[PDB]
Nucleic acid binder design. Structure first.
Lengths: 121, 80, 128, 205, 80, 155
RNA sequence: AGAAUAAGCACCGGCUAACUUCGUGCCAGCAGCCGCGGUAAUACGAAGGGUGCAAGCGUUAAUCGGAAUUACUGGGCGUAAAGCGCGCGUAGGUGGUUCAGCAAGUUGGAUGUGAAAUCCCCGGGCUCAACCUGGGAACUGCAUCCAAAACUACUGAGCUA
RNA sequence: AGUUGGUGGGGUAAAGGCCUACCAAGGCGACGAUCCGUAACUGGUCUGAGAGGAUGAUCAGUCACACUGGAACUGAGACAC
């Protein structure tokens, strides 16, 4: 606090590490699905969320949430992954963009179509 | 006319040259406190008079060694 | 010890918390001169120097409605961080109601006079 | 762009006489102004502090038909210009060519004035300006293009402008169908039902 | 060679020229030693078509600067 | 002619032998809108009773703030129990730039052009105390001249 | 010549402006945080309604702000994280009081420089704007010179707190 | 250990360990030398009430590079896209 103590050692600012290290300062990355599975949420929640392990183009292996109702993804499927974690899913820190490359948009969606890659009918 | 600097000499174990310490006081850009700074310069002394501890004056002058661009004006105070 | 001036302000400030009438303390050029600004500004009633080999400085104090006239007095140019300002950069205490004593080269004198005189200096203390 | 749609809902949501309809009939005889539009028009519920500012913001926006991007820039220019950000605000969008023509009475509503101005039917200072957002100055003369002099719409609206409150800061010559902008109005000249201080506070969020 | 030339400093389909004193090796809109005036070929109302600052124009001309074929015509037009 | 504003309504509780009891606490600020202001608290079992008990309590504890006119006089800082508040006078036109907890206080007290900021804790009850202490300690220029025994020439 | 060729996106539990019904029933799913959904869900999917924005609308990625949450302005250390177990002491930081000198700091002014563009102020030209441009301001800095001696630094001479 | 000075000589358009011969043991460093990782720099740009923080696209000034390493030639000017 002393102005002399500050002169020798200036105040230091911490730099928080990104919560999406596998994305590497890019808005989205392309990867392929190595394993499609369902997992169980934490204490409060109880469901079967669809998550897939993705091998990204920079070599990172991550698991990203598959949003929406129903998906057509299996092994060896090219997907685009976006940031944003899932709070009730441990270890999931990315989202799979529906409507790009192989992952088709959710069928029969009417509200919030752009967020889930849904065509206008 | 010509900018001459004043400082305390620190070393004279060389031949025909003496090293002078320059005292500066630059404020910290943020904390605004004067911190004493050091500027050791290799001054040239055509003949040797200055011993350690004497205040002398020097001019930016001809580069006449690889680290010697300043030469003496005179002794303003002698460390008796 | 290492800041006789700030001892002056804190001696004054402590007394006004205790509703004392007069204070005593060793005098100096700065202490007497700052008392000059305070008296001519009306924050202190009067000050005297007891001229002896060890001189004191005595200030009698002012209260208007029981509350001391000096609501707050704060040292600025402490020895650890001496503060120097230009004429334009001189502080305005409480939007001009207060006084920021500035030791210019025309003697010790207020911030209002320093702007009029067009000279800066060491911002010693602020009063209100 | 511009809002195209039913106009009472804009007034019904707020509950103030928005001048989106000509003064031929009072709004109560045309629409249920005592309820907000939609299925739940008969409810209650106090508006939050932020909601009041936002509703105040959209009243100025909907009256003159302005989108906020221009309004935010209009706020920025009002914040730029010296003086109070309050009255610097309303003058900026009161000097619009469409709004000035509406004050001249060439259109019964600002929607008529905007279409009439945008259709090259108005020349200010002798040059055709077909943009709603032109900023007219003091002493500028605004006239209708000579081919558009026989328009019944300005012919109808000029009389409708009589029973709307004669605005002082501009004068109109009926025979020439041309008017001159004397000077920008002050706060007293505009309606006091607005709260321009809610405009500034909202944009500080 | 120091030269007085026009630096295109306007906009698309709306040219504006700065009468610029510069070395001939520098780019058209790049480095220069001094700008002295400007020329507006599309000036409409209160825009001054050509301002020359006749004083400094002579000094660089006396120093050996060689105006281009456009500036020389504009220089005469300013004095005519 | 008294403008009244609600700062917050809070649901507190205490436990007894068997279950818990719920009490509603509301703090409101009252004032004439030009020169008078007052704040008060009230606890009652129900909100319509709660906001009302705050009303008389606020109107019974009011002071006289000495504004410069449509704005405050000098930039001041006031603190009360880990809640620090800074308020600064502003030119004509800018609205009430202050936190929603104190925005009611300046707007009710007649202040319309001021810049304010909350430092430290932002408990609405405590910040209201802090701004109140700053507004109460407000001094008009003629009062300061009286303290120093001079005219308005001190400016 | 003919309204004729031209409206979509996000959201509606609180934060945050904006709600009902139907189907599902801790499943499906939503989700920035609080969290919602286990059979009468304003929080899931759909419909209607509304809200905000509009040839754009949302999501992500990143910086600053909010964050007084590295606190110089502008934070703390009895118990919330934080006084070294305790002395001495080197560099450093800071130093009682009086007189005189000096002028590095300090203050004012002048000069040179601080490229142009940009930021900002007043105008001008594109139907306005974006954009361009005239002039001014600024570049809070550095260097030199001239004045001043309240305080600091230095020098010389003292005094006893 | 040409390391840091000195002396003589050579060399450059020019001073200089730039090079060399000899003499001395010097020179830098907690005011951070040396080493490791990263990185073109600035005017500026973003954000912020400001102080600050982040950043160095377009445009402008400087610098370095031209498939990798090195070298000279010509030329006023290069160790030359």
């Amino acid at each position: 606090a002393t102005i002399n103590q500050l002169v020798r050692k200036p105040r230091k600012r911490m730099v928080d590490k990104s919560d999406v290290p596998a994305l590497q300062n890019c808005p989205q990355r392309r990867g392929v699905c190595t394993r499609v599975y369902t997992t169980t949420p934490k204490k409060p929640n109880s469901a079967l969320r669809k998550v897939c392990r993705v091998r990204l183009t920079n070599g990172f292996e991550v698991s990203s949430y598959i949003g929406g109702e129903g998906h057509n993804l299996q092994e060896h499927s090219v997907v685009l992954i976006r940031g944003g974690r899932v709070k009730d899913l441990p270890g999931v820190r990315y989202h799979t963009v529906r409507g790009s490359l192989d992952t088709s948009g959710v069928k029969d969606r009417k509200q919030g179509r752009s967020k889930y890659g849904a065509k206008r009918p | 006319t010509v900018r001459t600097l004043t400082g305390r000499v620190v070393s004279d174990k060389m031949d025909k040259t003496v090293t002078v310490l320059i005292e500066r006081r630059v404020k910290h850009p943020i904390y605004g406190k004067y911190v004493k700074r050091s500027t050791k310069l290799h001054a040239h002394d055509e003949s040797n008079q200055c011993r350690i501890g004497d205040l002398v004056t020097i001019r930016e002058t001809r580069p006449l060694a690889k680290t010697k661009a300043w030469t003496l004006v005179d002794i303003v105070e002698r460390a008796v | 010890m290492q800041d006789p001036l700030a001892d002056m302000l804190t001696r004054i400030r402590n007394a006004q918390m205790a509703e004392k009438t007069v204070v005593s303390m060793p005098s100096s050029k700065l202490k007497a001169a700052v008392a000059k600004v305070l008296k001519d500004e009306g924050y202190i009633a009067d000050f005297q120097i007891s001229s002896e080999v060890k001189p004191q400085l005595s200030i009698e104090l002012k209260y208007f409605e029981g509350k001391p006239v000096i609501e707050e007095v704060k040292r600025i140019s402490r020895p650890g961080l001496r503060q120097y300002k230009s004429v334009e950069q001189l502080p305005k205490v409480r939007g001009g109601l207060g006084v920021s004593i500035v030791s210019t080269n025309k003697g010790v004198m207020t911030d209002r006079a320093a702007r009029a005189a067009g000279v800066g200096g060491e911002v010693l203390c602020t009063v209100f | 762009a511009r809002y195209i749609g039913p106009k009472c809902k804009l007034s019904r949501r707020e509950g103030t006489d928005l001048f989106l309809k000509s003064g031929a009939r009072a709004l109560d005889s045309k629409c249920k102004a005592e309820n907000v539009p939609g299925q739940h028009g008969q409810r209650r519920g106090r508006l939050s502090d932020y909601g009041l500012q936002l509703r105040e913001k959209q009243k100025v926006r909907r009256i003159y038909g302005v989108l906020e991007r221009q309004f935010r820039g209009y706020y920025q220019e009002a914040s730029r210009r010296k003086g109070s950000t309050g009255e610097n605000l309303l003058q900026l969008l009161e000097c619009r060519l469409d709004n000035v023509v509406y004050r001249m009475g060439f259109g019964s509503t600002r929607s008529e004035s905007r279409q009439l101005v945008s259709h090259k039917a108005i020349t200010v200072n002798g040059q055709t300006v077909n943009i709603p957002s032109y900023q007219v100055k003091a002493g500028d003369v605004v006239a209708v293009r000579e081919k558009s002099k026989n328009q019944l719409r300005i012919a109808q609206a000029l009389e409708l402008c009589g029973q709307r409150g004669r605005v002082e800061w501009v004068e109109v010559d009926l025979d020439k169908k041309a008017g001159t902008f004397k000077s920008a109005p002050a706060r007293s000249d505009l309606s006091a039902d607005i709260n321009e201080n809610l405009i500034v506070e909202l944009y500080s969020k | 060679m120091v030269t007085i030339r026009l630096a295109r400093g306007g906009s698309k389909k709306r040219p504006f020229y700065h009468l610029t004193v510069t070395n001939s090796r520098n780019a058209r809109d790049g480095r220069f030693v001094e700008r002295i005036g400007f020329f507006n070929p599309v000036a409409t109302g209160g825009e001054v078509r050509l301002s020359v600052d006749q004083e400094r124009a002579t000094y660089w001309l006396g120093q050996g600067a060689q105006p281009s074929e456009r500036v020389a015509q504009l220089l005469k037009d300013a004095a005519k | 002619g008294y403008i009244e504003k609600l700062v917050q309504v809070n649901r507190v509780a205490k436990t007894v032998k068997g279950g818990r009891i719920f009490a509603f606490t509301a703090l409101t600020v009252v004032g004439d809108g030009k020169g008078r202001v007052g704040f008060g608290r009230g606890k009652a079992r129900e909100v319509p009773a709660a906001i009302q008990k705050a009303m008389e309590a606020a109107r019974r504890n009011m002071i006289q703030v000495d504004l410069n006119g449509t704005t405050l006089q000098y930039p001041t800082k006031s603190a009360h129990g880990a809640s620090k508040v800074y308020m600064q006078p502003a030119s004509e036109g800018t609205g009430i730039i202050a936190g929603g907890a104190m925005r009611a206080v300046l707007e009710v007290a007649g202040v319309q052009n001021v810049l304010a900021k909350c430092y430290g804790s932002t408990n609405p009850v405590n910040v209201v105390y802090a701004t109140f202490k700053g507004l109460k300690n407000m001094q008009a220029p003629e009062a300061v001249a009286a303290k120093r025994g001079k005219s308005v020439e001190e400016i």
